[PDB]
Amino acid sequence: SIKEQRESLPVFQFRDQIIQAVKDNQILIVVGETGSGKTTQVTQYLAEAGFTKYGMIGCTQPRRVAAVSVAKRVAEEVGCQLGQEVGYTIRFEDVTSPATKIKYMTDGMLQREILMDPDLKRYSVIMLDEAHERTIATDVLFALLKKTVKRRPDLKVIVTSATLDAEKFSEYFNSCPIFTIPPVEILYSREPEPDYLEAALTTVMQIHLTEPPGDILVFLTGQEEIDTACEILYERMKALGPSVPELIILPIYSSRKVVIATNIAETSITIDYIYYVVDPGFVPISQAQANQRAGRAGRTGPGKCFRLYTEAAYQSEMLPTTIPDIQRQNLANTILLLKAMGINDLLRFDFMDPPPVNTMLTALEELYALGALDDEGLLTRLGRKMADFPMEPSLSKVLIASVDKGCSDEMVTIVSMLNLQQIFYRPKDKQQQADQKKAKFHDPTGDHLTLLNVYNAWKNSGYSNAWCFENYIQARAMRRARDVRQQIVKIMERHRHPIISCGRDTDKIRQALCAGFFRNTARKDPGYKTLTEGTPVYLHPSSALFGKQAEWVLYHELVLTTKEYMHFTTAIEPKWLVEAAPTFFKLAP
């Protein structure tokens, strides 16, 4: 039943108590142990209590997927169509209606939303649900909401927290109350294991045979560690014997079952029926993170956690408080927005956890080199124009540069294609066959123009799914690209940025892509080496210029599956970098 499921949750007992705490206290810290359902239920409770009469309820989630996942879930519970009373907003996916009482979104959208109205009048209550996997963009929000609260008293702010992080939050938010919302044994090693990988595998071996049935979850650091573990565990399982229950071993890089994942994956997994966790505790992690990890065993039933370090280590060489995760490109975006609110002076800024000065100086230098900031560091005309685009400052810079070069039509398509997850379906039985079809779209210049070739031919075939399948192109991905393209075209048109085509002048198109994306360039070494930092990076085999020789290249992203790899590489001329990417590479007259 919908009611029965809702009432089953631990929060429902404290449901009347939560509403009173919000009604009295302006800012409220909520500690809910995972599986309390504070994420879904609290939003409804405040809606049910009439907080949506004169405002919306907004909740920020750490990832895009989480905001979509919670919104759909809450929609079912509320019993209404997604986007109507309960909707989510994420980048280029605003699933909301005028009739939207409850809204879910990422920190970035809130930052765009707060910049437009520093008082957030459209909202009655703002809740940030990122107890774990908090960033600096989330920390910036805290300081902004602290000021917003001093000018709009009716506004309610809820801030979820981990138990270790809780008291620090309360001190920061003017000593406001900490509302709290209510089994596994943790095992340690007497001496620090010399080899964490060997220890962890032996640990997985003993637990598979010598323990009651449960599923094991292991965490590792690198891909080569994962691959080595898969081979070792296969070899030991086959040698062990046929009587022994089969061990199904699956890795994740986002009879009994073993799952092995990295930190990237740990933040995005809700797998059930696992009674055992192996915690190598070294990426070194924090006590709050270690405790969160321990809890994951306790999800389905009782169970055990195996931390591969001394207890003293837990209490000595591990800090409890979360360290906010800093993304270099996200931080540039955050700083750009802050300067668009007229907030300079990052040194005296009310940061709850001060970011390292290098991170802020690199971000400032990156924006300066893009020409978002002048010599002083004050926001320029170009910076304000870029801040109107909800994307990384490199991509927004490329769009505006293309308008100057009369090639905005091709760029909006290329920019659309960069956001895409998977573009080409590949099946191992027909892998060779798929690669042959991909080759038709290969442009000499590089992957950027190859993406332009894919979308154009898709457009030319009237956007046919049969055509997509004919060429082993993900049909869903192209549809997503068009949705993004249409939204970008509307954003450009609203600002004074027209759409002009130039008949695939590859020189103008790649020149445009050098205006931004100039700190992601590399030169061929007798693989390649990065111009900016000197880091060695390699062409991916799937690249359109992978066979070809190309002395100077430009890459959209830098993936690390095994060794540093450039994602979407395009051959460019050095001249354009001096000319179109001025400040950084003007080592000419």
Residue numbers in the entry: 549 to 730, 735 to 806, 824 to 852, 870 to 1112, 1115 to 1177
Provide the authors' original text about this structure:
An additional crystal structure of Prp22 in absence of RNA and adenosine nucleotide could be solved. The two Prp22 molecules found in the asymmetric unit exhibit virtually identical organization of the RecA1 and C-terminal domains, but strongly differ in the position of the RecA2 domain with respect to rest of the protein. Although significantly elevated B-factors of the RecA2 domain did not allow to build a complete model of this domain (133 of 173 RecA2 residues for Apo1 and 141 of 173 RecA2 residues for Apo2), enough portions of the domain were traceable in the electron density to unambiguously place it with respect to the RecA1 and C-terminal domains. The two different positions of the RecA2 domain together with the increased B-factor values suggest that in absence of any interaction partner this domain has a high degree of freedom to move as a rigid body. In contrast to previously solved adenosine nucleotide-bound structures of genuine DEAH-box ATPases, the RecA2 domains of both Apo structures display an increased distance toward the RecA1 domain. While the RecA1-RecA2 center of mass distance ranges between 27.3–27.7 Å when ADP/ATP is bound, this distance is increased to up to 31 Å in the unliganded state. The intrinsic mobility of the RecA2 domain allows the helicase core to adopt more open conformations than were previously known from adenosine nucleotide-bound structures. A Prp22 Apo structure highlights the mobility of the RecA2 domain in the absence of any adenosine nucleotide. After the release of the ADP, all nucleotide-mediated interactions between both RecA-like domains are lost. Together with the loss of contact of the RecA2 domain with the RNA backbone, this probably enables a complete detachment of the RecA2 domain and allows independent movement as implied by the Prp22 Apo structure. In contrast, without bound RNA the RecA2 domain is not optimally prepositioned due to its intrinsic mobility, leading to a prolonged ATP sensing time.
